[PDB]
Amino acid sequence: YAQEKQDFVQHFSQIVRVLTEDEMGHPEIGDAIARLKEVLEYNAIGGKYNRGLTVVVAFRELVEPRKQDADSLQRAWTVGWCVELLQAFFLVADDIMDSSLTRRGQICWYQKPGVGLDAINDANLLEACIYRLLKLYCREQPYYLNLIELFLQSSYQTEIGQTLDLLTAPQGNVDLVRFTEKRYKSIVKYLTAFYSFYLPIAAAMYMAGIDGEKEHANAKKILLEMGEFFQIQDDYLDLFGDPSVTGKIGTDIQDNKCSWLVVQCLQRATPEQYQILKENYGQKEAEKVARVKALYEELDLPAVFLQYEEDSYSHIMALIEQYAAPLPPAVFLGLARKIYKRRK
Amino acid sequence: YAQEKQDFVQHFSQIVRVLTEDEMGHPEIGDAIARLKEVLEYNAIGGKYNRGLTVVVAFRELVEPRKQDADSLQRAWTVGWCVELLQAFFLVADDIMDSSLTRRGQICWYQKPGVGLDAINDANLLEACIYRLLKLYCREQPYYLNLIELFLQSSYQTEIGQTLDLLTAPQGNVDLVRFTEKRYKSIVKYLTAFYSFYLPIAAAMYMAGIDGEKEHANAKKILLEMGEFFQIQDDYLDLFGDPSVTGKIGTDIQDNKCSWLVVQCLQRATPEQYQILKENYGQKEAEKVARVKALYEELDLPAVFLQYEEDSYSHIMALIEQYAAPLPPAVFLGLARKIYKRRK
Ligand SMILES: O=P(O)(O)C(O)(Cc1cccnc1)P(=O)(O)O
Ligand SMILES: O=P(O)(O)C(O)(Cc1cccnc1)P(=O)(O)O
Ligand SMILES: C=C(C)CCOP(=O)(O)OP(=O)(O)O
Ligand SMILES: C=C(C)CCOP(=O)(O)OP(=O)(O)O
Ligand SMILES: [Mg+2]
Ligand SMILES: [Mg+2]
Ligand SMILES: [Mg+2]
Ligand SMILES: [Mg+2]
Ligand SMILES: [Mg+2]
Ligand SMILES: [Mg+2]
């Protein structure tokens, strides 16, 4: 797996080179292009590259090796990097809105001295780079428009998910009544499940020439369920994770977020425990945040998570057995293995 | 002209209706859709609608009236509203980054209590709505991909212009040496000239089936020059404009912006006057901002602007005479008339 990763990261230098080549033809925007490189180098590198690697691995498993030529394989890891750019755009913006401190083992881009809210445009430039690369490498391809629409839809989906997340998590207002299982499943479906799990497999499918409605609908049933689990896992790691491993500091309690943990807490809270949560949740005070963590540990939520993860993996495996065909089960199995029991 | 405007604004209620119809099929995202309507109602309404109206007026002048059917005309004002959505996205984001107080006669969306930096996602949703409308009304059209790429390119262009603007205007740092005419022309070309003047005429050209490289290149020569003047006019109105008319408070001096006014000031400043500008520019202090305004008025920059506007209009008119053909000169003349001597 570490060999798959290294080949993918080795292509980033050319991705930057092609995206910052504009300085030759237009020396006037030289500084802007130099800032884009700085934004690319900081915000697209450091992660696990699960989405980008999924595009590359799913492409090799869906396309016949006699068809996988040098150009065809370059297009596959360029689209992989396009998904990594979509990730970069989403995270730079989300770290501002969530008032987060760290990302991928370093300070958040907006928290850097000399950046600040300029990071909003930087996030937008990262998004702009997807369509630049799609045009430079896939314009003459039959799946060109299908990939453009798939990335556009992925953006709208996450942004609607982001609207739901932000409306359920108001700063200064107690929203315990909206923290339900039905609300949670609606948020994470749009917010994470589509771009993190459906988008990479669907992009590799369109590139393989699998554009069928039924085929895409079947992959979606598995992948949207995989995405729900991945977000539940991220919600657990925000509180019970190790920041040296995760590369980020948790803010869900301070930010009044509709975390899977608070949904589970409210399902098992006594009237007394509900007031402890009402009085201490969604506030900046360290002592208040510590009080909520103590209640989660008291309701044995880390073990509730361990049981969920076991039942969830068995459900996703049952979904692979039901809907994988005619695609190789390894397509969905490889991604499932890379996220199950994850600590990063 | 006021009759052209009223018909265009009357179509906004249907634009909202089609974009917020998702609540029927998906009641789970109801609140998110309700927030999108609130974002659309606040941020896409209030302006002069020059870009949206340009798409509609240029379409009727380029397409034969026997071909202008009910569906064909609906597609024209939908693409007009798509340009107004691109404007909304840019302004919501720019008002955060510029730390502006008002927009279109009301408080900035991000300055609204309960909104704040959530406005970043709201800006992104406005951008998402362009491609939603392009898909719902122009997917079966021969110019579909051409319009998608034209809006994508318009975004990258403005965002690169925005990178240049923000890098030349650092908070806390004296950047008088970079405030040159060559730097100014580079910023506003990418930042404003492409999306505000080229994008509306080019979209109406593609819809009329005029996709020729030479035809688009010729319109670009006129329109990019028109855009340079429009930004110069906006830079003048930031200081010498009336906020009841403009609907916005100026921040260029406080924000250390490479304004056309500071470029002209530095070209006419004595060594003594240069130090007055160096000591008082780019700071929040009201007295410091007032000192810079006094120097501009002392160098007679409002009259320097009046002479520029006269020479600029004659240059753009000469460009219409050179490059309008085979397009009707009214296409470029109508837009020129709507921005020349502007106070809004
Ligand atoms: O990495 P983070 O900040 O923990 C997160 O997962 C980031 C994110 C951004 C956009 C879409 N989905 C997740 P969040 O939702 O704020 O918990
Ligand atoms: O409306 P504003 O804020 O005066 C402006 O024109 C807004 C704007 C946003 C995006 C592109 N071009 C202009 P700016 O450049 O900040 O002076
Ligand atoms: C969808 C959510 C959970 C955001 C972060 O995802 P990752 O955990 O995949 O972050 P990176 O690997 O890209 O750094
Ligand atoms: C390109 C710049 C100068 C931003 C504002 O343009 P407008 O003056 O056209 O603003 P609205 O009419 O859309 O409100
Ligand atoms: Mg976050
Ligand atoms: Mg978030
Ligand atoms: Mg999280
Ligand atoms: Mg501004
Ligand atoms: Mg600005
Ligand atoms: Mg201005």
Short mmCIF file of C-alpha atoms in Angstrom, two decimals, chain B residues 28-322:
data_model
loop_
_atom_site.label_atom_id
_atom_site.label_comp_id
_atom_site.label_asym_id
_atom_site.label_seq_id
_atom_site.Cartn_x
_atom_site.Cartn_y
_atom_site.Cartn_z
CA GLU B 28 -34.36 16.14 4.88
CA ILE B 29 -32.36 19.14 3.40
CA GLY B 30 -35.42 21.46 3.81
CA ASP B 31 -33.58 23.85 6.21
CA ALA B 32 -30.51 23.98 3.86
CA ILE B 33 -32.77 24.83 0.88
CA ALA B 34 -34.58 27.45 3.08
CA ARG B 35 -31.14 28.99 3.89
CA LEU B 36 -30.21 28.96 0.10
CA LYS B 37 -33.40 30.98 -0.64
CA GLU B 38 -32.39 33.48 2.12
CA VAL B 39 -28.84 33.74 0.57
CA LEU B 40 -30.35 34.18 -3.00
CA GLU B 41 -32.93 36.83 -1.84
CA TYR B 42 -30.28 38.84 0.02
CA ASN B 43 -27.18 38.58 -2.21
CA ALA B 44 -28.45 38.38 -5.85
CA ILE B 45 -30.93 41.30 -5.55
CA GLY B 46 -30.21 45.02 -5.13
CA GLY B 47 -27.63 45.75 -7.86
CA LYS B 48 -27.93 47.40 -11.31
CA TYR B 49 -28.06 43.91 -13.06
CA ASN B 50 -25.79 45.23 -15.88
CA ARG B 51 -24.20 41.79 -16.52
CA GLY B 52 -27.51 39.85 -16.54
CA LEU B 53 -29.24 42.52 -18.68
CA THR B 54 -26.21 42.51 -21.08
CA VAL B 55 -26.75 38.73 -21.71
CA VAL B 56 -30.49 39.32 -22.48
CA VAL B 57 -30.01 42.50 -24.66
CA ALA B 58 -26.95 41.02 -26.53
CA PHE B 59 -28.93 37.78 -27.20
CA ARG B 60 -31.90 39.66 -28.83
CA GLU B 61 -29.42 41.72 -31.00
CA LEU B 62 -27.41 38.67 -32.14
CA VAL B 63 -30.25 36.11 -32.72
CA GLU B 64 -32.80 36.45 -35.61
CA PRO B 65 -36.29 37.27 -34.06
CA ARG B 66 -37.98 34.32 -35.90
CA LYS B 67 -35.61 31.98 -33.95
CA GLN B 68 -36.16 33.74 -30.53
CA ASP B 69 -38.89 31.32 -29.20
CA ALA B 70 -40.27 31.18 -25.56
CA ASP B 71 -37.78 28.46 -24.45
CA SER B 72 -34.83 30.15 -26.28
CA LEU B 73 -35.64 33.48 -24.53
CA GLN B 74 -36.01 31.72 -21.09
CA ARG B 75 -32.51 30.19 -21.59
CA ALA B 76 -31.16 33.74 -22.33
CA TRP B 77 -32.44 35.33 -19.04
CA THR B 78 -31.49 32.16 -17.05
CA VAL B 79 -27.84 32.57 -18.27
CA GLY B 80 -28.25 36.32 -17.42
CA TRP B 81 -29.19 35.32 -13.85
CA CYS B 82 -26.21 32.81 -13.84
CA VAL B 83 -23.88 35.82 -14.41
CA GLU B 84 -25.76 37.66 -11.53
CA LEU B 85 -25.09 34.55 -9.32
CA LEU B 86 -21.36 34.66 -10.25
CA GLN B 87 -21.43 38.39 -9.17
CA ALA B 88 -23.19 37.43 -5.84
CA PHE B 89 -20.57 34.72 -5.14
CA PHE B 90 -17.65 37.14 -5.85
CA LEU B 91 -19.10 40.06 -3.79
CA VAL B 92 -20.05 37.97 -0.66
CA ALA B 93 -16.45 36.60 -0.56
CA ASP B 94 -14.78 39.95 -1.46
CA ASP B 95 -16.79 41.82 1.30
CA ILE B 96 -15.35 39.37 3.93
CA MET B 97 -11.75 39.74 2.58
CA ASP B 98 -12.04 43.55 2.23
CA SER B 99 -13.69 43.87 5.71
CA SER B 100 -16.45 45.99 4.10
CA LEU B 101 -19.48 47.28 6.00
CA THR B 102 -22.23 47.73 3.40
CA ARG B 103 -23.26 46.35 0.00
CA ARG B 104 -26.19 47.48 -2.21
CA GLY B 105 -27.73 49.79 0.46
CA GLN B 106 -27.71 47.19 3.27
CA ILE B 107 -25.24 45.59 5.72
CA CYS B 108 -22.86 42.96 4.16
CA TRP B 109 -24.17 39.37 4.40
CA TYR B 110 -21.17 38.28 6.61
CA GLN B 111 -21.76 41.34 8.90
CA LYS B 112 -25.35 40.08 9.58
CA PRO B 113 -25.86 38.67 13.13
CA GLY B 114 -26.06 34.87 12.90
CA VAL B 115 -24.17 34.65 9.57
CA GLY B 116 -20.48 35.58 10.05
CA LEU B 117 -17.86 33.36 8.39
CA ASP B 118 -20.72 30.90 7.49
CA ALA B 119 -21.05 33.33 4.54
CA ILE B 120 -18.01 31.52 2.94
CA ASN B 121 -20.21 28.42 2.25
CA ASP B 122 -23.15 30.68 1.26
CA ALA B 123 -20.85 32.34 -1.37
CA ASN B 124 -19.89 28.81 -2.66
CA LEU B 125 -23.62 27.79 -2.85
CA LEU B 126 -24.28 30.88 -5.06
CA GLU B 127 -21.52 29.60 -7.39
CA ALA B 128 -23.01 26.06 -7.25
CA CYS B 129 -26.38 27.45 -8.46
CA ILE B 130 -24.87 28.63 -11.84
CA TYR B 131 -24.12 25.00 -12.97
CA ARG B 132 -27.47 23.80 -11.52
CA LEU B 133 -29.34 26.28 -13.82
CA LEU B 134 -26.97 25.63 -16.82
CA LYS B 135 -27.84 21.89 -16.46
CA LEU B 136 -31.64 22.39 -15.92
CA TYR B 137 -32.06 24.70 -18.98
CA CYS B 138 -29.05 24.33 -21.38
CA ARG B 139 -27.94 20.60 -21.09
CA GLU B 140 -29.43 19.56 -24.51
CA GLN B 141 -27.97 22.73 -26.26
CA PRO B 142 -24.93 22.67 -28.63
CA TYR B 143 -23.30 25.51 -26.58
CA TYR B 144 -23.72 23.69 -23.15
CA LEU B 145 -19.99 22.79 -22.61
CA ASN B 146 -18.87 26.21 -24.07
CA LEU B 147 -21.00 28.07 -21.40
CA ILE B 148 -19.76 25.75 -18.57
CA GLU B 149 -16.07 26.36 -19.55
CA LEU B 150 -16.74 30.15 -20.00
CA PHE B 151 -18.14 30.42 -16.41
CA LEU B 152 -15.30 28.16 -15.02
CA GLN B 153 -12.65 30.31 -16.76
CA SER B 154 -14.38 33.50 -15.52
CA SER B 155 -14.01 32.19 -11.93
CA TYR B 156 -10.28 31.33 -12.33
CA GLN B 157 -9.62 34.72 -14.00
CA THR B 158 -11.29 36.78 -11.13
CA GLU B 159 -9.65 34.56 -8.44
CA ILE B 160 -6.19 35.14 -9.99
CA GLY B 161 -7.05 38.88 -10.15
CA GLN B 162 -8.14 38.61 -6.49
CA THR B 163 -4.73 36.91 -5.63
CA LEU B 164 -2.93 39.90 -7.28
CA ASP B 165 -5.17 42.49 -5.51
CA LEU B 166 -4.68 40.83 -2.05
CA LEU B 167 -0.84 40.32 -2.50
CA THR B 168 -0.40 44.04 -3.53
CA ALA B 169 -2.59 45.13 -0.56
CA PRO B 170 -1.01 43.50 2.56
CA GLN B 171 -2.43 44.49 5.95
CA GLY B 172 0.32 46.12 8.05
CA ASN B 173 2.91 46.48 5.23
CA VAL B 174 3.79 49.64 3.12
CA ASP B 175 3.58 48.59 -0.58
CA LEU B 176 3.91 52.04 -2.36
CA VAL B 177 6.72 50.68 -4.63
CA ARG B 178 4.31 48.06 -6.17
CA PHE B 179 1.53 50.65 -6.81
CA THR B 180 2.41 51.23 -10.50
CA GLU B 181 0.29 51.63 -13.70
CA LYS B 182 1.66 48.29 -15.10
CA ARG B 183 0.66 46.45 -11.85
CA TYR B 184 -2.80 48.12 -11.79
CA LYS B 185 -3.64 47.10 -15.44
CA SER B 186 -2.62 43.45 -14.61
CA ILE B 187 -4.88 43.24 -11.49
CA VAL B 188 -8.14 44.68 -12.93
CA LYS B 189 -7.76 42.65 -16.23
CA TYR B 190 -8.15 39.33 -14.40
CA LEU B 191 -10.16 40.67 -11.40
CA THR B 192 -12.94 42.54 -13.24
CA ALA B 193 -12.55 43.01 -17.05
CA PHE B 194 -13.13 39.30 -17.94
CA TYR B 195 -16.26 38.37 -15.84
CA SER B 196 -17.94 41.83 -15.85
CA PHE B 197 -17.56 42.66 -19.58
CA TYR B 198 -16.23 39.71 -21.64
CA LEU B 199 -18.28 36.90 -19.93
CA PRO B 200 -21.79 38.47 -20.63
CA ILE B 201 -21.13 39.27 -24.34
CA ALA B 202 -19.29 35.93 -24.91
CA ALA B 203 -22.16 33.90 -23.27
CA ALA B 204 -24.75 35.63 -25.56
CA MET B 205 -22.40 34.98 -28.57
CA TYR B 206 -22.13 31.18 -27.85
CA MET B 207 -25.97 31.02 -27.38
CA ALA B 208 -26.30 32.75 -30.82
CA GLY B 209 -23.90 30.08 -32.17
CA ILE B 210 -20.97 32.53 -32.68
CA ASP B 211 -18.16 30.34 -31.29
CA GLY B 212 -15.33 31.56 -33.62
CA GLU B 213 -11.88 32.21 -32.10
CA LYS B 214 -11.36 35.43 -34.15
CA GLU B 215 -14.89 36.78 -33.29
CA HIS B 216 -14.40 36.10 -29.52
CA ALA B 217 -10.83 37.50 -29.64
CA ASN B 218 -12.14 40.74 -31.34
CA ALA B 219 -14.98 41.29 -28.77
CA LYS B 220 -12.37 40.62 -25.99
CA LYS B 221 -10.11 43.55 -27.26
CA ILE B 222 -13.02 46.04 -26.72
CA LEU B 223 -14.57 44.49 -23.57
CA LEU B 224 -11.31 43.98 -21.59
CA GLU B 225 -10.58 47.71 -22.19
CA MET B 226 -14.15 48.60 -21.05
CA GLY B 227 -13.55 46.54 -17.89
CA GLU B 228 -10.31 48.43 -17.07
CA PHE B 229 -12.29 51.76 -17.16
CA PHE B 230 -15.18 50.31 -15.06
CA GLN B 231 -12.77 49.30 -12.26
CA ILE B 232 -10.99 52.73 -12.45
CA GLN B 233 -14.49 54.29 -12.01
CA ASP B 234 -15.18 51.93 -8.96
CA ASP B 235 -11.81 52.95 -7.47
CA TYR B 236 -12.81 56.66 -7.80
CA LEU B 237 -16.32 56.05 -6.33
CA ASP B 238 -14.76 54.28 -3.27
CA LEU B 239 -13.49 57.70 -2.10
CA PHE B 240 -15.41 60.42 -4.02
CA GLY B 241 -18.76 58.56 -4.36
CA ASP B 242 -22.02 58.97 -2.38
CA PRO B 243 -22.81 55.88 -0.21
CA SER B 244 -26.58 56.53 -0.51
CA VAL B 245 -26.12 56.22 -4.32
CA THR B 246 -23.28 53.58 -4.37
CA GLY B 247 -24.85 51.49 -1.52
CA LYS B 248 -21.37 50.74 -0.09
CA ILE B 249 -18.69 52.36 2.18
CA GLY B 250 -15.14 52.76 0.81
CA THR B 251 -12.23 50.82 2.41
CA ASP B 252 -9.43 51.09 -0.26
CA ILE B 253 -7.20 53.51 1.77
CA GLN B 254 -7.63 51.51 5.07
CA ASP B 255 -7.02 48.25 3.13
CA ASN B 256 -3.73 49.45 1.42
CA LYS B 257 -5.31 48.67 -2.00
CA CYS B 258 -3.56 49.30 -5.32
CA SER B 259 -6.32 51.80 -6.21
CA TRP B 260 -6.08 53.81 -9.49
CA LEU B 261 -6.18 56.93 -7.22
CA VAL B 262 -2.96 55.94 -5.29
CA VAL B 263 -1.22 55.07 -8.66
CA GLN B 264 -2.11 58.58 -9.99
CA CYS B 265 -1.15 60.22 -6.64
CA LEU B 266 2.36 58.62 -6.66
CA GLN B 267 2.83 59.78 -10.32
CA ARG B 268 2.21 63.46 -9.24
CA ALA B 269 3.61 63.47 -5.63
CA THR B 270 6.52 65.67 -4.48
CA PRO B 271 9.06 64.01 -2.07
CA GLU B 272 7.16 65.67 0.89
CA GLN B 273 3.73 64.42 -0.40
CA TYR B 274 5.11 60.88 -0.90
CA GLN B 275 6.01 60.72 2.87
CA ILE B 276 2.46 61.98 3.77
CA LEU B 277 1.08 59.04 1.71
CA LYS B 278 3.67 56.54 3.16
CA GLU B 279 2.78 57.54 6.78
CA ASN B 280 -1.04 57.61 6.40
CA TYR B 281 -1.96 54.97 3.77
CA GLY B 282 -3.19 51.44 4.60
CA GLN B 283 -4.25 52.20 8.20
CA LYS B 284 -7.63 52.04 10.07
CA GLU B 285 -7.20 55.52 11.66
CA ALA B 286 -9.94 57.91 10.36
CA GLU B 287 -7.51 60.91 10.63
CA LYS B 288 -4.90 59.02 8.51
CA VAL B 289 -7.53 58.14 5.83
CA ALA B 290 -8.73 61.85 5.87
CA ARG B 291 -5.07 62.98 5.34
CA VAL B 292 -4.76 60.79 2.16
CA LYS B 293 -8.14 62.15 0.79
CA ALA B 294 -6.80 65.74 1.35
CA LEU B 295 -3.64 64.91 -0.70
CA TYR B 296 -5.76 63.41 -3.56
CA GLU B 297 -7.92 66.61 -3.57
CA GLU B 298 -4.68 68.70 -3.42
CA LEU B 299 -3.19 66.88 -6.48
CA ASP B 300 -6.61 67.52 -8.20
CA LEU B 301 -7.19 63.75 -8.76
CA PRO B 302 -11.09 64.13 -9.15
CA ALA B 303 -10.37 66.31 -12.27
CA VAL B 304 -7.59 63.86 -13.40
CA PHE B 305 -10.35 61.16 -13.28
CA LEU B 306 -12.78 63.36 -15.35
CA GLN B 307 -10.08 63.78 -18.07
CA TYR B 308 -9.24 59.99 -17.97
CA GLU B 309 -12.99 59.09 -18.36
CA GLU B 310 -13.26 61.39 -21.50
CA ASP B 311 -10.04 59.96 -23.12
CA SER B 312 -11.04 56.35 -22.10
CA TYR B 313 -14.57 56.60 -23.66
CA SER B 314 -13.00 57.93 -26.94
CA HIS B 315 -10.51 54.99 -26.89
CA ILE B 316 -13.30 52.37 -26.30
CA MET B 317 -15.36 54.06 -29.13
CA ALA B 318 -12.32 53.78 -31.45
CA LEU B 319 -12.08 50.06 -30.43
CA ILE B 320 -15.80 49.58 -31.27
CA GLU B 321 -15.13 51.09 -34.77
CA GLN B 322 -12.07 48.81 -35.25
#
